[PDB]
Amino acid sequence: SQIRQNYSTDVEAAVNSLVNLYLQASYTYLSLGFYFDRDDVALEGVSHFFRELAAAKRAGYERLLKMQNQRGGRALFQDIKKPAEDEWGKTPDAMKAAMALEKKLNQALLDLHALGSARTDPHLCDFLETHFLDEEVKLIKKMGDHLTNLHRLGGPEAGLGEYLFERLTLK
Amino acid sequence: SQIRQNYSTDVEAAVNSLVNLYLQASYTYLSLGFYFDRDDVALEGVSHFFRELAAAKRAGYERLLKMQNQRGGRALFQDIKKPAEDEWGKTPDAMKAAMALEKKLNQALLDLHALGSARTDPHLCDFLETHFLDEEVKLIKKMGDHLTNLHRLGGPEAGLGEYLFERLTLK
Amino acid sequence: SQIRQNYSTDVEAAVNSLVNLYLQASYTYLSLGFYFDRDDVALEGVSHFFRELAAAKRAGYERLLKMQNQRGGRALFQDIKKPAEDEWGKTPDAMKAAMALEKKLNQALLDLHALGSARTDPHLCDFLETHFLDEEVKLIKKMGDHLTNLHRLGGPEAGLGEYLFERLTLK
Amino acid sequence: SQIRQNYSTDVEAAVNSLVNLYLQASYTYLSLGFYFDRDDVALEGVSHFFRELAAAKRAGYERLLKMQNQRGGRALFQDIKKPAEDEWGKTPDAMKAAMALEKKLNQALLDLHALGSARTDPHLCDFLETHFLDEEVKLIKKMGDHLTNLHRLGGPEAGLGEYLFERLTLK
Ligand SMILES: [Fe+3]
Ligand SMILES: [Fe+3]
Ligand SMILES: [Fe+3]
Ligand SMILES: [Fe+3]
Ligand SMILES: [Fe+3]
Ligand SMILES: [Fe+3]
Ligand SMILES: [Fe+3]
Ligand SMILES: [Fe+3]
Ligand SMILES: [Fe+3]
Ligand SMILES: [Fe+3]
Ligand SMILES: [Fe+3]
Ligand SMILES: [Fe+3]
Ligand SMILES: [Fe+3]
Ligand SMILES: [Fe+3]
Ligand SMILES: [Fe+3]
Ligand SMILES: [Fe+3]
Ligand SMILES: [Fe+3]
Ligand SMILES: [Fe+3]
Ligand SMILES: [Fe+3]
Ligand SMILES: [Fe+3]
Ligand SMILES: [Fe+3]
Ligand SMILES: [Fe+3]
Ligand SMILES: [Fe+3]
Ligand SMILES: [O]
Ligand SMILES: [O]
Ligand SMILES: [O]
Ligand SMILES: [O]
């Protein structure tokens, strides 16, 4: 590559790997999105929440692909694994799955930062610092807040809580 | 008729028949509308919902009458049967009646499409495809969503649920 | 399902199947998009062309998923197969791959129309007629036009042709 | 210095050194700029391209000088070495020289980041991360793209290619 400079084969491959992780996460959010739109689930605000995350994850992998090209890396794509579940339960269940997915993505981001730090690749580090790490932190905080409000609305009268949360918190 | 072309006597009569079905459905929604406006029912958003459907069904039969005239058919009107009930219960009860009415109208629409398909009348088919079939599908989906939200708000604390639904879902 | 009416299990499954085909096609266009953005390919207009198709295919599968929910179907997702190639050659090569992909999607659409026609499901038929069939036809015509212009610009001085086409035809 | 804090003598001197490298690079781009404006070269778009880089490099050294003052460093200036060539050849030749210059500047930037990292000077690191590293990466990618398009337009009919590139790619 005529442009490649300070860009290790390890980062390149880990970038390709993080791309597939974002594709898979996007896919997961697509599935949660349509799930909450089913006539027998029917929580429009929950559906919108997960649809937006699909979109947000797609921006993530598009930005990783662009950075790959900018550094002189070559994108390689693998199969995208189907989401882990077909039916996602109630809002708390789905929100817990989403939290778990975001934590996995955040760990992959931190591992990639550690890697690029180890290959003294400050561009790669900064790129993640600027476009990824704070967004995960904000999003995780938000999902925690949601879980706290669902838990407070939970238990005995869970059905009413789920309705109120979708109406009064989600948009 | 100087304009009539490819327009079978069967379609013509089935169109007249579907007209009476829309008139009757409009009538049913009129009754549900005023029902939820009674001082002892007093669910303004439910009332508005059913009033709008009366209006929507009237547009339906007006469009069938116009198409009848355009194809060279002759409108014939029968008595409009009074609605099946005088008192409509709670929101879930009424919403179930509405669902059942929409399913009946949808089946009549599908039967008329089958008929016009059998008389190779593609205008009649397309007319239904364009002005009726998707609207039934959207409306049925919406009524399902509503039923799911009422069910979730149901049971022990049904009175509160009925209030919240009318306030936070219906407009 | 409380809303499902005239919606066969076969259509439902074929809809799920067409969804995976759109996901895979979207994926293919993603790959072609970044391919033409590589510093050693560097055909920005070709890149934009394929990026737009990724987006267009995503709208396709989102509309199929929405229709699935509207009819009372249940979405089921499988693994998304990686694109058939890692390197896509020159503009004519990639444009031929795209043509071949669009023809496959069009055949799947026509097969699904045949199926829904056979289950007398006029909603499903019309939905495809309105949101899919004409768009494939226009797009295929466009890809043919492109292939004709690349062929005319081809052979001995292929490198110059590829440059001019990207600059003067693609946007 | 009454303001100096965490600012090593090594960084200070390496900053002065990077300044002279930017001055020299600016000078190189000045020379390429006027070169392509000669009546016997006459490639206005190539001239503009290199003139802009002169300007961009000047912003670079001005920002390094400002940072020097902000940290309590003292600017020291040396002679600015004349550009390596008097005549710059064809667009591909000049674009290769520019690529080689940008790679040298990028390596100097990376070496200075390594240095400030080694003196645990996170301000210096971030400053480079924010104002320099991504700009080099974007610019190098752009110069690669250009080289790919010139190469595609190259060889037998190089004169025509050079004309088209200047007219249809450069602004
Ligand atoms: Fe939102
Ligand atoms: Fe399951
Ligand atoms: Fe708020
Ligand atoms: Fe929002
Ligand atoms: Fe929004
Ligand atoms: Fe309304
Ligand atoms: Fe009664
Ligand atoms: Fe149509
Ligand atoms: Fe048709
Ligand atoms: Fe709403
Ligand atoms: Fe309204
Ligand atoms: Fe209204
Ligand atoms: Fe376009
Ligand atoms: Fe390959
Ligand atoms: Fe049609
Ligand atoms: Fe044109
Ligand atoms: Fe466009
Ligand atoms: Fe565009
Ligand atoms: Fe410029
Ligand atoms: Fe010379
Ligand atoms: Fe451009
Ligand atoms: Fe400009
Ligand atoms: Fe300019
Ligand atoms: O939103
Ligand atoms: O409404
Ligand atoms: O475009
Ligand atoms: O420019």
DSSP letters for B18-58:
HHHHHHHHHHHHHHHHHHHHSTTT--HHHHHHHHHHHHHHH
Instruction: Let me know: does C164 contact D164? Beta carbons within 8 Å.
Output: yes
Residues in chain B, total: 171
Structure tokens at C48: 């934009």
Quote the CA–CA distance of C81 and C27 in Å, as a whole number.
8
User: Which amino acid would we find at residue C12?
Assistant: E
> For the residues of D7-72, what is the DSSP string, one character each?
--HHHHHHHHHHHHHHHHHHHHHHHHHHHHHSTTT--HHHHHHHHHHHHHHHHHHHHHHHHHHHHT
Element (H, E) at B5: none
Cβ neighbour number for residue D18 with a 10 Å cutoff: 22
Instruction: Let me know: does A153 contact A165? Beta carbons within 8 Å.
Output: yes
> Among candidates B91, A50, A41, B50, which has minimal Cα distance to C3?
A41
Quote the CA–CA distance of C61 and A58 in Å, as a whole number.
15
> For the residues of C54-104, what is the DSSP string, one character each?
HHHHHHHHHHHHHHHHHHT-------BPPPS-S---SHHHHHHHHHHHHHH
Instruction: Let me know: does A88 contact A32? Beta carbons within 8 Å.
Output: yes
Torsion of CA C30, C32, C33, C35, to 10 degrees: 120
Quote the CA–CA distance of C87 and C94 in Å, as a whole number.
9
From the list A2, A6, A126, the residue facing D129 with the nearest CB is A126
In B72-129, alpha helices (H): 91-118, 122-128
Backbone angles phi, psi at D13, to 5 degrees: -75, -30
Element (H, E) at D140: helix D134-152
Structure tokens at C105: 């999607």
Deposited experimental method: X-ray
Crossing angle between the packed helical segments B158-168 and A158-168, to the nearest 10 degrees: 10
CA–centroid distance for A67 within its chain: 18
Quote the CA–CA distance of B115 and B106 in Å, as a whole number.
14
Backbone angles phi, psi at C80, to 5 degrees: -100, 120
As beta bridge partners, residue D132 has none
Quote the CA–CA distance of A140 and A127 in Å, as a whole number.
20
Q: Kindly list the distances between the CA atom of residue D49 and the CA atoms of C140, D52, D134, D160, in Å, as whole numbers in the listed order.
A: 39, 5, 19, 19
From the list A42, A157, A163, the residue facing B145 with the nearest CB is A42
> Among candidates D30, D163, D33, D147, which has minimal Cα distance to D92?
D147
The DSSP secondary-structure symbol of D101 reads H
For residue D91, give the 3-state DSSP assignment.
helix
> Which residues 6+ apart lie within 8 Å of C138 measured at CB?
none
Structure tokens at D82: 């004349």
D114-121 long-range contacts, Cβ below 8 Å, gap at least 24? D114/A120, D115/D10, D115/D11, D115/D14, D116/D8, D116/D11, D117/A120, D117/A122, D119/D8, D119/D10, D119/D11, D120/D6, D121/D6, D121/D7, D121/D8, D121/D11
Torsion of CA B131, B133, B138, B144, to 10 degrees: 140
Which residue of chain D is at minimal alpha-carbon distance from C41? D148
Backbone angles phi, psi at A80, to 5 degrees: -100, 120
Q: What is the resolution of this structure in A?
A: 2.2
Yes or no, beta carbons of B125 and C123 under 8 Å apart:
no
Quote the CA–CA distance of A86 and D164 in Å, as a whole number.
55
As beta bridge partners, residue A80 has C80
Instruction: Let me know: does A88 contact A34? Beta carbons within 8 Å.
Output: no
Task: Kindly list the protein residues that place their beta carbon closer than 5 angstroms to ligand 6, a single-atom ion.
Answer: B 52
Q: How far is the CA of C131 from the centre of ligand 8 (A)?
A: 10
Q: How far is the CA of C27 from the centre of ligand 21 (A)?
A: 25
User: Which amino acid would we find at residue D99?
Assistant: M
Question: Exposure string (b/e) for B19-36, b if CB count within 10 Å is 16 or more?
Answer: bbbbbbbbbbbbbbbebb
Instruction: Let me know: does A82 contact C77? Beta carbons within 8 Å.
Output: yes
Instruction: Let me know: does C41 contact D148? Beta carbons within 8 Å.
Output: yes
> Among candidates D143, D138, D156, which has minimal Cα distance to D32?
D143
> Which residues 6+ apart lie within 8 Å of B159 measured at CB?
none
* HEC readout, chain A: CCCCCCCCHHHHHHHHHHHHHHHHHHHHHHHHHHHHHCCCCCCHHHHHHHHHHHHHHHHHHHHHHHHHHHHCCCCCCCCECCCCCCCCCCHHHHHHHHHHHHHHHHHHHHHHHHHHHHCCCHHHHHHHHHHHHHHHHHHHHHHHHHHHHHHHCCHHHHHHHHHHHHHHCCC
Residue of minimum CA distance from atom 1 in ligand 24: A171
B171 lines ligand 25 (CB under 6 A): yes
Q: Which residue has the tokens 């110059």?
A: C160
Quote the CA–CA distance of D36 and D166 in Å, as a whole number.
11
Determine the distance in angstroms separating the CA of C164 from the nearest CA of chain A, rounded to an integer: 23
Structure tokens at B159: 């009175």
Q: Kindly list the distances between the CA atom of residue B14 and the CA atoms of B1, B11, B68, B77, B110, in Å, as whole numbers in the listed order.
A: 18, 5, 11, 12, 12
Quote the CA–CA distance of B91 and B143 in Å, as a whole number.
11
> Among candidates A40, A46, A20, which has minimal Cα distance to A146?
A46
Q: Which residue has the tokens 């036009």?
A: C145
- For chain C, the chains sharing at least 3 beta-carbon pairs closer than 8 angstroms are A, B, D
CA–centroid distance for C74 within its chain: 23
Q: How far is the CA of D171 from the centre of ligand 27 (A)?
A: 5
For residue B8, give the 3-state DSSP assignment.
coil
Q: Kindly list the distances between the CA atom of residue C168 and the CA atoms of B3, C37, C47, in Å, as whole numbers in the listed order.
A: 52, 18, 14
> Among candidates C15, C19, C108, C33, which has minimal Cα distance to C61?
C19
Quote the CA–CA distance of D59 and D52 in Å, as a whole number.
11
Residue of minimum CA distance from atom 1 in ligand 26: C171
- State the sign of the Cα–Cα–Cα–Cα dihedral B160, B161, B166, B168: positive
- For chain B, the chains sharing at least 3 beta-carbon pairs closer than 8 angstroms are A, C
Which residue of chain A is at minimal alpha-carbon distance from B169? A167
> Which residues 6+ apart lie within 8 Å of B91 measured at CB?
B36, B43, B46, B150, B162, B165, B166
